[PDB]
Amino acid sequence: MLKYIIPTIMLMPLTWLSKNNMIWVNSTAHSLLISFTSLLLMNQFGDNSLNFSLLFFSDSLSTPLLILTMWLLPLMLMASQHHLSKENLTRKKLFITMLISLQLFLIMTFTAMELILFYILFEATLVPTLIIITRWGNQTERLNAGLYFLFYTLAGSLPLLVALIYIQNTVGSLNFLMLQYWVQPVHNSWSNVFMWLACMMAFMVKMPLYGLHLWLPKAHVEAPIAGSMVLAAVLLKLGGYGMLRITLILNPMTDFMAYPFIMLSLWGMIMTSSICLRQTDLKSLIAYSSVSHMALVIVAILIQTPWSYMGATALMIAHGLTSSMLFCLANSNYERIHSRTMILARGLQTLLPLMATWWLLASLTNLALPPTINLIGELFVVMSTFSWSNITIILMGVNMVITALYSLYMLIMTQRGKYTYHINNISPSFTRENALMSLHILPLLLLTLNPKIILGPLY
Amino acid sequence: AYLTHQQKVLRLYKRALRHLESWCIHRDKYRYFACLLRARFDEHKNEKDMVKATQLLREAEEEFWHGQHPQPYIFPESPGGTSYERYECYKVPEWCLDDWHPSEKAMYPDYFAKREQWKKLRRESWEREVKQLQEETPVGGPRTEALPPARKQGDLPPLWWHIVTRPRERPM
Amino acid sequence: SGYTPEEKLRLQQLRELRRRWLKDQELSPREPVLPPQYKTYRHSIFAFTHVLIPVWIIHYYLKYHVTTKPYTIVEKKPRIFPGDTILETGEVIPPMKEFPDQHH
């Protein structure tokens, strides 16, 4: 993984030694080249994962997440460079450094072969993310949002640390390859009930689980656009990725420990989809959409079947590109009208035609229109949940109805109707903004042609 | 209610005629029953007691509600009609032309020359319009949404731009 | 009930401006100032480019790729009726047995 770690580090000297007018050009160009070379990770085998060294490995689960992570850094740079234009030059370089350092922790987190190394990097992402939100957010509430983000994560992470060290003491290793062969079943006891909870609660908070999701509407709304892009696209997937790995060592106790959390998710998604129908803030609406989608990922991981793991992996990738695109779409409006209120600016399809096409395409992927990989993932999860219990089709079906209503409600309210008369600064969409939109949607729609590379290890 | 007794009776008359027309359909049948309905209104035209007049109006409304058409005729472009707001998607505010690229503006050199004159006329009149409104408005703001005309030569009626330059009813 | 004199005067002044505005929307003779830039033959190049070239590609694709793999194109086997002659083998399918030839 050094062929990605080292060049990712070299982005930092590149940004700091660039001419004052080339920091965005240079960093964007070279983060795209790193993104290109990440495709070499798709040398995957049917039986064996790609094991580079004692420290890092890649498999069909981590590979697509790595490719998404390295692709997002260029997109976060283009999204940021407009609202940071007036920023002091050295503070601009520091902002880029936080994004680069976040990428470095992410690509190592998704490939660390030992769970305690995963834990340290899993936790190291808090620092740059917290700094990005609190330093470069716009509102007063960004300070409170950082505190909620920090302590919701840590309240779950600290028990995980104790559990992992306990597992290493008793098993003798936390290397994930070793855990595949030395795993022993977990027999019922109050001691093991709390080992299970400590192994799963840190990842549930990151997803987030319904009930523990309050940090996300605050954090995903107060953050600058780049912060929201990474929070929705990747950082939420640390929870899903972590669960997918650690559930190996939790069987068969997951049989009955999953019930309270499946209930929170099945009912949670219907609750958080319904919330989106009455949201007045466009960014808040998108954030609550992420909770609804990640509820399916939680259920798919917990029921633990070959189809649900394929569906969970597809959903995580598809949601990352969609949710990131929606935040970017809403940001373009915000950079014009300086407000997140959804009803403020209406009938925008009349004033910004092409950008209304992106809104439509983003909305269709969100409501899981076939054969998008959003539908592929969402359908595979529904297939496996039906087998788990047929009655779940009722809750999945209702959520699919509600999701279409709020996806098209957001499209109709902002893009259709009559334009607001007094808003007269809707300038035509910039090339940067159009390209930023097409760099989400085009890769997302291309993956439909070859969906096997985003279905994970159980394909 | 801010409608006088006269305005309520006259409104009820028109509304009842339209609903009567929806029941009758055929023009000759409508003319016959529109005159009987007019005779009923003429029968109490001179009622002087306001108390008795109001009671007559109350009953007429109750009768109208009982006998109204469940699906009355609506003009296509009227609120509720099948063409209402059909062309709102084609109405683009004039300020959008300021963002046009120069190569787009070069296609209509004569149109944008006139447009500049209108924008010049808007700037040079704005101050007088504000001043006129200030000096004709009683303390504590206006009591009505009515606006004055221009009182001088060269003065434009205050707050005219968005009335004069509004989109055409059939823009495309 | 009609307009008041102030109301009438304001309407009069707006009307002059509105009609002048609408007049100025008319295009001049030269506008737009563009920058620099029988059926059988017309129908022939449509059939060529939209029917023949595609069917060439599709036939090539089906004949040398799709049909070289098993069970890609599966046909219902032909119906065989009494009295038919099989082309593959020349076998003659026996006729049906005699009816009561009842008619009405």
């Binding site: 009349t350 004033l351 910004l352 035609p353 035509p428 969409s429 910039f430 090339t431 | 683009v92 505010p93 004039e94 959008c96 032309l97 963002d99 046009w100 690229h101 190569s103 787009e104 209509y108 149109y111 989109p167 055409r168 823009p171 495309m172 | 929307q25 008319e26 295009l27």
Partner: peptide, 12 residues
């Protein structure tokens, strides 16, 4: 009479 059609800039 041909009238001017007001549209947002299509150039960009």
């Amino acid at each position: 009479k041909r009238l001017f059609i007001i549209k947002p800039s299509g150039f960009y």
